Amino acid sequence: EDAGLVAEAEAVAAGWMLDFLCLSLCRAFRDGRSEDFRRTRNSAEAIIHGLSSLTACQLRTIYICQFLTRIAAGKTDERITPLESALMIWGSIEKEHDKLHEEIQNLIKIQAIAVCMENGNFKEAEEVFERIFPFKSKLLMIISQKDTFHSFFQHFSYNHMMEKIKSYVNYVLSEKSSTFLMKAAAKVVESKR
């Protein structure tokens, strides 16, 4: 056997497993299946170590997986919070900066502050505000007055952030719905049955 050809076959399979795990992570995030998301995330993290060179499409895929991971950890080394880390990933992905990208970005910026207020850490909410940012002065008075349920926070809510991110996840889910591993697995299931 040729070790080089064996290593090449292992790299192709890693690529297939990555797309499968991304598609599975997207569904668990859309469905609210938290433990399934955690298991799929751990699997994707492990599989991604079998790839040392990634194509442009594979890089976009791992960054979507990292993004959804921080968003899922939003309310639960970097010296920043998970939502501030999701914001850094979001602004760096090789993707179009359309209306949806912009509204997801702004919802994360406000939710990175609001999740700290929800947890009762108002000093942390101020530190998050200083790192991200008359609008700023109003937002700073809201945090200072512990006005968690201010109408602004209700419009740029957590549920609205999740709905917008889930709409983006549906496009990713559609784009990868037909990848090799899932398509072959569906055929085996449909043949039984």
- Judged by the rule CB under 6 A, the positions of this chain that interact with ligand JP4 are 41, 44-45, 48, 62, 65-66, 69
Per-residue string for binding with a copy of itself, 23-42, x by CB under 8 A? -x--x---x-------xx-x
Would you give the DSSP letter of residue 151? H
The residue assigned the tokens 């889910």 is 173
List % helix, strand, coil for the chain (3-state, nearest 5). Answer: 75, 0, 25
Would you give the DSSP letter of residue 119? T
Q: How far apart are CA 70 and CA 83, in angstroms?
A: 6
Q: How far apart are CA 114 and CA 112, in angstroms?
A: 6
**What beta strand segments (E) does 46-173 contain?**
none
Residue 191 binds a copy of itself (CB under 8 A): no
Q: Taking CB within 5 to 8 Å according to partner kind, which of ligand JP4, a copy of itself, none is near residue 62?
A: ligand JP4
Which string of DSSP letters, residue by residue, matches 35-54? HHHHHHHHHHHHHGGG-SS-
Q: Taking CB within 5 to 8 Å according to partner kind, which of ligand JP4, a copy of itself, none is near residue 24?
A: a copy of itself
Q: Taking CB within 5 to 8 Å according to partner kind, which of a copy of itself, ligand JP4, none is near residue 49?
A: a copy of itself
CA angle 47, 51, 56 (to 5 degrees): 110
Residue 76 in 3-state DSSP?
coil
- Among positions 29, 32, 45, 107, the unique one binding a copy of itself when judged by CB under 8 A: 45
Residue 93 or 182: the one with the smaller Cβ distance to a copy of itself is 182
Residue 58 or 121: the one with the smaller Cβ distance to a copy of itself is 58
Residues making contact with a copy of itself (CB under 8 A):
3, 5-6, 8-10, 12-13, 16-17, 20, 24, 27, 31, 39-40, 42-43, 45-47, 49-50, 180-182, 184-186, 188-190
